[PDB]
Symmetry: T
């Protein structure tokens, strides 16, 4: 069983700026944590990070029927992309939306999510542990 | 070690009653049991309170200041309306996880705003009652001065 | 057969200020009128007035399955309380919303009603006779 | 004693035709009959007019000034759009009850505003055609200088 | 002689009895008489129409194209609501003066917008029925220059 | 088989102002084009143009069950009339909304259409050819 | 003997030069001349002020309280922006006619709102400088009643 | 002697420990003591109630009708949200002074609206707990004139 | 004579896959075939491109400037969001017909705004894939300096 | 020795005459008198200015920088409209108490917003002229700490 | 010979003192000096005015009509509020470059709107006092063409 | 020498032919040449990239972190729409000058908002391609002080 792990724009920079101020956790840390949780359920993870909205949409489309679900952190595309929302819908994958930080503690333009309209679940502000909980949700939906 | 304050707001006592094949079969008892079981995995306890009275939830937040490690709250309809409850979360100084069973963003526009999200360390929506399990996990693992 | 008659905040003050300016009708008048109409249909009325939103919600919850319907004048909670709307829904009682005055002739913040989203019927500006008409609606829905 | 002006606006002539098991089987004839029967209980008469033409309803309001005791109106879609109809209600000086068969607040956002509600003594929504019966009862019992 | 189209929209037939504290006690007959007297000073005539029917005002505008020097219009409630009536004023090509008896910008917020003001050469509000007299003056003097 | 062709306020003035600036096409041109397209499908056209909203509503009501569909250019009523929207719904006719010009290139108050909420299809800015395409849509829906 | 306060707000001194396709070829001198001549037909006088300084218009309104029969005002850009000027019109207790040379409701959205229209007995827009003549007519005939 | 109703809404019991950088270190006891001392200067008494329950504040207002010279209220969060509490202030007929410790108009936009300000005779914000002292002064002097 | 640029935006490749009895059975291949067939009736050709990448559609618009007679575009979700795509339509100077298969006005409020409608000569919504056929007809018949 | 800058903005000179049912029968002289007498109880002086000219209030704020302990201001209609005046209060670095005689949040919606409240340490509304006395009390006791 | 009108609106006289973390440590004297020196490199002169009085800026715009090659303006808080000043820029017919020391679109929402940007040929924000140098460069080179 | 990243977003490759009445007749080559000449005056180089692809601009920003003294960006349409691009400017830690050829605040209301202005040190609009010259000047002089 395979989960699609998608990380959107800027997520490649996790842990790359001064980590004492901007965080020590890296994208590799995110993938490893999601992968280890998936392994507890006999599942695998296909991970992709891209600063290109089209590469995420292509990935969602290509995973239709082949994956049990999608964990997505869309980054700034959260607030802006109808096309990304329509790609989650077209994929027909049960999708969990993850934010490492709590967008509602940030600027008001970050409060709105298009993805939240189609996501089965939304996890914000749990740090990279949101990706662990997202894998648990998809593992357990699939079992039901 | 320590105690988590579990707060369920108005209407949460009625979980599982209306059209369960559409809205869910899980009950408030199931919620408290699931959170209490996850807390035990971390050597923690849960003090659960459900109320239809905003002031009862505010009283509980105030009384838990300095004696509890954190709060898991599902404010129900107060989520969208109560400044006083947000100020009670801040006054408690409890690190707070906001939980919704359903995804409010899939519902009416008035349900898309949360006062509690402004102060919550984390917000979990649409994971069913599993949201409460992940909330207990977050509070168990939070360290002083994180983020 | 029993109808739940709920009166929200401030309704206890009906008829208590100078009645020539603020009205002669009292809460007792409201309960008696609803009760007499209910009696015409072989029905009874359980009446509660509270300045506490929680006492109304508790009442709605406790009347689930035991009452044929709810007549509610929510007072200022009309415009503000999502929790009260969700309590009407959770009660599963057919609910008639009553306003003694016409809110639409008052300040604009009184124009919006959360209760109107779940109420079967809304009666405004008929004075205390709105409670009579509300009982008639519930008596006749029950008969069908 | 006296005559009530019963006004039904655009589309009310088509009551009972579209998906009646969902929207209703009652007809305009049923509405006029029900209001006329309630009026008779109070020694009153009804003059009923339905029109798809705003100006016909305005003409009728003007012509009823001083000769009728009040107006029961269901403006249909004009409810949300017509300042001229509101001004015609005011010009008629008829105490006016606004009636909707369905509850407009359960429908699209544009149906939540009513110009007529600003001038109406009473507004009844969602009582089916029984709304017209209660409206006649209100006008029968209204006293000069009430509220 | 040249002719001015005087159009009064819904409810203006009720002038005199209609909310006098707002509209005064002057009647539609008084409005037409004053406009007619002012036009005569300029050697002009007035063709007056009041209707409660938006389509009658539109028909009148179309039918006045090319035979009238201009239009004086009080659209009443239709002021705030009718795109169709604005489009009829434009299609008539009549220089159009918009008149209101009350001052709508001192009244409810729903009266603050005017479709007709987008096409009117001039707008007069709150001058009781004298607005119609000034409107005729505007049109007589526009025609003299053009 | 009959199509109801409705033209709303001001459409009678098509081609009547200086045509080099305001257009040469006339209402007669619109009716002839729709009629000729309908004839290609063995269908007829009943055409009505009115500056009166009530005459359009009456027409829609009277065509219930007797016509295969309605082509409507509502003119300025597009943006304003809930009553006209409710008349399209009450008619139960499959309805195509036509604009000769593109309203979205005009003032912002012309961007909103009530009719678009009930119309099966919306054609804007194709000139009078939008009426031809509207007839094609209704001919082909009827065949299915 | 009866006196009308004629106030013109910012930029009105530039009439005849300022954006002629919007405001026309008439001058502030033409405006004052027309208002003055109309007032004389009613046996009234005109005290005219134009200023680019809001405070000078407000002082003029206060100073005319109880001594003048009314005010004709074209506030210019202050029409859309100044609560202080609205409050000065109300403090003056002068019946006030608001005049605009241009039709503001045919221009940018920010010109659609007028604080002065909340207190004005009458508003005239788009009649060129003739709006000032009609405004004197209004004030002359309100006083006469 | 005359009596002033001092009402503090939700969270004000936590004054002292609650967000001191915003609310200061003065306690509810300090608030009640200062109001009580000021009232005594005017030969008046204070009946103080704090509650986290909107209905207890409403009950208190109803029950103070006709036995209190006025009300000093800090509604806390309910300021921005409660029509019911405004309606209770109105029904009490108590001359009402609205007090805020912080300046809400310098804070989040959701704190910029006040239902209570629609019925309050006066509103004092941002004067720490001294707002309650000035509020008592307002009510003592209103009563002296009326 | 000449070539029409047919652009289909994000997700249009997935046409016909999700709940086809509800959303439709027609495919992107059907769209290209229908537009290509109508173009042939007018002695015209079609260059079709579908992409999930906004920049690919912008590149295509730029590369078609002066070499194509017009553009038929269904921007998909970019309709509501992309200023850059509107500016690419303007930079191409291609007369452009905007096509939607479904009627966006019957859907969520955010789908009611189109940047492309501001520059498009025509907008067709809700004619199914027949919209693309009418779009090709419009471009075939457009004359220089019309309207 | 300590000096308080007392500023009154447009129309305040008309107190006692201007819309008495809203503003009452007290005068600007009563306001300055009350503020002056309260300041004296704290051993402070008052420098009072009223102007219908925004620029005169802004100059006064700049000129009081570093020499005064605080500002009491009633901006009048400028309360709702002037970013320049807010920026003048911030440039002054004076602790500022905003005073309104009327309760603006009980009046027209356009009076609900105050640029000055963004910088003011305190806002008093609806206490008649007594708000100016409480404002001096605030400034006296902030300085004392 | 060619003359540039340099206008600074309210509070700009307080540069170097006013909220240094937002506006920096440069003075109005530094601003005028930099603009003057840049204009000289193009053989142009600068006529500089700063005022806390909107009416003084409007008078300056009118008085520079036809005699000056362009205007560099920092309107201060009036940027967001004054239709009268926008209309004065249009009446002047001067090519106008709008300058802000701070980046207003990085500050409070009420600073996001500029009436002046509707008429300005160019807008420079956040370049400190160097924006005034670039503004002279723009005006010098528009005139040269 | 130090290097400045010059980024041009969608449609700017079409400068010269694109709506000249709005953007002028200067080409992207001219933009790059002018920025390059100005940088040389300060002993600096320019690395220029134009793309119609938001992700290529983001990749460029990430890849320029720590090797460039600053960024000059004209985001084109993405200005008003892209949170992702703002977040990339922030993550790059490059002092960033935002440049527009046209004055967007004199144009459609949808052009009035800029995400990039929230992180840019400076914003220059409406100076034709000279905005890029001033932008280089800003970055050369910021670097000299820091």
């Amino acid at each position: 069983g395979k989960i699609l792990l998608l990380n959107g724009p800027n997520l490649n920079m996790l842990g790359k700026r001064e980590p004492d101020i901007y965080g020590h956790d890296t994208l590799e840390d995110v993938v490893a944590l999601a992968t280890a949780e998936a392994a507890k359920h006999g599942l695998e993870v296909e991970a992709l990070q891209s600063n290109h909205e089209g590469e995420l949409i292509d990935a969602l489309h290509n995973a239709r029927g082949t994956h049990i679900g999608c964990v997505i952190n869309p980054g700034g595309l959260t607030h802006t992309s109808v096309a990304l929302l329509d790609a989650v819908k077209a994929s027909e994958l049960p999708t969990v939306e993850v934010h490492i930080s709590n967008p509602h503690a940030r600027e008001e333009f970050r409060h709105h999510s298009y993805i939240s309209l189609a996501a089965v679940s939304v996890i914000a502000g749990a740090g990279i542990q949101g990706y662990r909980f997202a894998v648990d949700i998809l593992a357990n939906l699939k079992k039901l």
